[PDB]
Amino acid sequence: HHHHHHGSMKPYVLKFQEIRPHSEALVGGKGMNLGACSNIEGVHVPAGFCLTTEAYKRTLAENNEFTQLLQRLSSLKTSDMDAIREISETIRTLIQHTQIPSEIASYMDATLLDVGGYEMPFAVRSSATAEAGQHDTYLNIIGKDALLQHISMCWASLFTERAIIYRIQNQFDHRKVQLAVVIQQMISPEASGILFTADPITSNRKSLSIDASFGLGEALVSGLVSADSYTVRENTITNKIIATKKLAIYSLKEGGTETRILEKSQQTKQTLTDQQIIQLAKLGRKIEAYFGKPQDIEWCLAEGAFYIVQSRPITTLYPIPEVNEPGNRVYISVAHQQMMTDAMKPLGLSFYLMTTPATMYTAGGRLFVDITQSLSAKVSRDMMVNSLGQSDPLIKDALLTVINKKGFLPPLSIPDSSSVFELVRNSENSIKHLKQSIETKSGSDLFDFIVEDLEELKRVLFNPTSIDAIMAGMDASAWLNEHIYQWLGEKNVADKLSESAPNNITSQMYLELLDVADVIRPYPAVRAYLEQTKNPDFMNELATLEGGAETKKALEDYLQKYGMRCAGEIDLTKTRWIENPLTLIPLILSNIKNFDSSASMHKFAQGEKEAFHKEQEILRRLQELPDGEQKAMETKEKIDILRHFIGYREYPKYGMINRYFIYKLALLRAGEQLVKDGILQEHEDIYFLYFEELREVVRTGQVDYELINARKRDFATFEKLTPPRILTSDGEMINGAILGLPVSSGTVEGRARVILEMEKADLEDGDILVTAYTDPSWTPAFVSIKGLVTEVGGLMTHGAVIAREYGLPAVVGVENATTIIKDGQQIRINGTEGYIEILD
Cis omega before residue 97 (within 30°)?
A: no
Residue 602 annotated in active site: no
The answer for residues whose C-beta is within 8 angstroms of residue 223's C-beta and 6 or more apart is 249, 257, 259, 773
Strands 788-790 and 810-812, sheet pairing:
parallel
Strands 747-754 and 826-830, sheet pairing:
antiparallel
836: β partners: 738, 829
Residue 369 Cα distances to 357, 366, 614, angstroms: 12, 11, 38
Q: How far apart are CA 802 and CA 781, in angstroms?
A: 11
In the β-sheet with 366-370, what is the strand arrangement from edge to edge? 360-363, 366-370, 330-333, 726-728, 733-734
Q: How far apart are CA 262 and CA 246, in angstroms?
A: 5
Strands 360-363 and 366-370, sheet pairing:
antiparallel
| Cβ contact 649:473 at 8 Å | yes
DSSP assignment, residue 174?
A: T
3-state class (DSSP) for residue 180: strand
Element (H, E) at 377: none
DSSP H helices, 75-225, are 83-97, 102-112, 144-155, 161-169, 218-221
Residue 63 Cα distances to 83, 163, 742, angstroms: 22, 21, 50
CA 482 from centre of chain: 39
DSSP assignment, residue 58?
A: I
Residue 114 Cα distances to 15, 49, 167, angstroms: 11, 11, 38
| Cβ contact 320:205 at 8 Å | yes
Q: How far apart are CA 11 and CA 20, in angstroms?
A: 13
CB atoms within 10 A of CB 389: 15
DSSP code string of 242-262: -----EEEEE-SSSSEEEEE-
Residue 1 Cα distances to 5, 7, 8, angstroms: 6, 9, 11
Q: Strand locations in 315-416, DSSP E? A: 330-333, 360-363, 366-370
Residue 89 Cα distances to 58, 84, 92, 98, angstroms: 22, 8, 5, 14
Q: Which residues in the chain are followed by a discontinuity, with C-to-N distance exceeding 2.5 angstroms? A: 131, 412, 736
Cis omega before residue 42 (within 30°)?
A: no
Q: How far apart are CA 112 and CA 110, in angstroms?
A: 6
Residue type, 338: Q
Q: How far apart are CA 355 and CA 544, in angstroms?
A: 44
| Cβ contact 519:542 at 8 Å | no
The answer for residues whose C-beta is within 8 angstroms of residue 825's C-beta and 6 or more apart is 751, 752, 838
Write down the catalytic residue from 150, 174, 644, 798: 798
DSSP assignment, residue 206?
A: T
Q: How far apart are CA 707 and CA 804, in angstroms?
A: 31
